Design a protein around this ligand. Structure first.
Ligand code: CA
Lengths: 214, 211
């Protein structure tokens, strides 16, 4: 079936530039109009730009016109989004999307998305503090002061699945913070070991903190 | 520009109940209205195209109606695999525009929280900081209240709250509460306590430790 795969999302300082791209597969690309749609948690979905099949006509909304340049390669089946004069309000997840029409229309297919963050903050690996207690016990793990998202938190490399709660991040001092809890039988601890592994790809960092009785 | 207006914003219905979503355009757009479904972490999925054309592979308990400016999306028997966010989209005039969405929560039995409080770790202290955490898991509804009071007092500055989406298993919510405050202001104040207010209990559900 149809397949769209974005790539390119990264951290960028305000007023910066970046180029997003889409790998179109499973359908005759040269026949449909393509487009970008972004999504912010505070303002939902938002059409960012569109381009026609032969790429001769392009349409952007006003809050983007000038800064954004959409384009394509029908020979290579790739869609592109050039961005400049980047702003904090441009921070969102961008979706590669297909129109069912030769020009524009609704959206039948959507890629998996790529995230764009616009900030002055510098990449920082997170600090990981084990959270232990002073029928079944509940342990924690605090991932504090990192940037930017995401951080992948697993327990025992994934061995523990049931009763795991990872709560969304929160910007507090201009750095994210998140925590995760896990519930295990009172017998399986501190007999069996328990560890939260926190991987932060942005800084190629990955820590493994073992929880132990204080 | 055509202004699509969605409603209701949210809507906590319970299994089988009828789900009605409406969208109004500030201008006549004919039958150029489309609807989308989007579950947590995932792109939007197509469900109804132009002319109220139900999508192939889409269940038959999903229907669309309208022409002009007033449009209505309908889920008949809401199955617990419908709990997502939905969005309408006008499409007869650039710039394309979506509704602000309608989120759906599963209306389900009440559930009291499992509170858990953790004192700050030595490692963090060593770094010159202190963070007391308090987990509150598997409850319902989300509408809960967490109060913190340092040494029998009442502090509420320098606290973070995170809420997990409604569990896809027991449809319950969970939230964590972090209290950050330099090691100094920490170890020399005595009773750190976490207090909650959920409609499952009549009195304040507490949880605390002493340094
Ligand atoms: Ca149309």
């Amino acid at each position: 079936e149809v397949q769209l795969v974005e790539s390119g999302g990264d951290l960028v300082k305000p007023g910066g530039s970046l180029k997003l791209s889409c790998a179109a597969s499973g359908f005759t690309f040269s026949s449909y109009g393509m487009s970008w749609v972004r999504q912010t948690p505070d303002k939902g979905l938002e059409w960012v730009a569109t381009i026609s099949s032969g790429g001769s006509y392009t349409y952007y909304p006003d809050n983007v016109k000038g800064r954004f340049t959409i384009s394509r390669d029908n020979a290579k089946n790739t869609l592109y989004l050039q961005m400049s004069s980047l702003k904090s309000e441009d921070t969102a997840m961008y979706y590669c999307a297909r129109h069912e029409d030769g020009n524009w229309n609704y959206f039948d297919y959507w890629g998996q998305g790529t995230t764009l963050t616009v900030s002055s903050a510098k990449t920082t690996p997170p600090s990981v503090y084990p959270l232990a207690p002073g029928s079944m016990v509940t342990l924690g793990c605090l991932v504090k002061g990192y940037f930017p998202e995401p951080v992948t938190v697993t327990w025992n490399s994934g061995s523990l699945s049931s009763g795991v709660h990872t709560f969304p991040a929160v910007l507090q001092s201009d750095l994210y913070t998140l925590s995760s809890s896990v519930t295990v039988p009172s017998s399986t601890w501190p007999s069996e070991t328990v560890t939260c592994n926190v991987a932060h790809p942005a800084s190629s960092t990955k820590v493994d903190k073992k929880i132990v009785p204080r | 520009e055509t202004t699509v207006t969605q409603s209701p914003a949210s809507l906590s219905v319970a299994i089988g109940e009828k789900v009605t979503i409406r969208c109004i355009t500030s201008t006549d757009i004919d039958d150029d209205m489309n609807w989308y479904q989007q579950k947590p972490g995932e792109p939007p999925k197509f469900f109804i195209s132009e002319g109220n054309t139900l999508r192939p592979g889409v269940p038959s308990r999903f229907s669309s109606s309208g022409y002009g400016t007033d449009f209505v999306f309908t889920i008949e028997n809401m199955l617990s695999e419908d709990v997502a966010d939905y969005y309408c989209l006008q499409s007869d005039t650039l710039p394309l525009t979506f509704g602000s969405g309608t989120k759906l929560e599963i209306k389900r039995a009440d559930a009291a929280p499992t509170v858990s409080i953790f004192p700050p770790s030595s490692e963090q202290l060593t770094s010159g900081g202190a963070s007391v955490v308090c987990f509150l898991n598997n409850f319902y509804p989300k509408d809960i209240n967490v109060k913190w009071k340092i040494d029998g007092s009442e502090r509420q500055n320098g606290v973070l709250n995170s809420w997990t989406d409604q569990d896809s298993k027991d449809s319950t919510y969970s939230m964590s509460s972090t209290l950050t405050l330099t090691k100094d202001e920490y170890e020399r104040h005595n009773s750190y306590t976490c207090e909650a207010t959920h409609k499952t209990s009549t009195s304040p559900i507490v949880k605390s430790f002493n340094r």
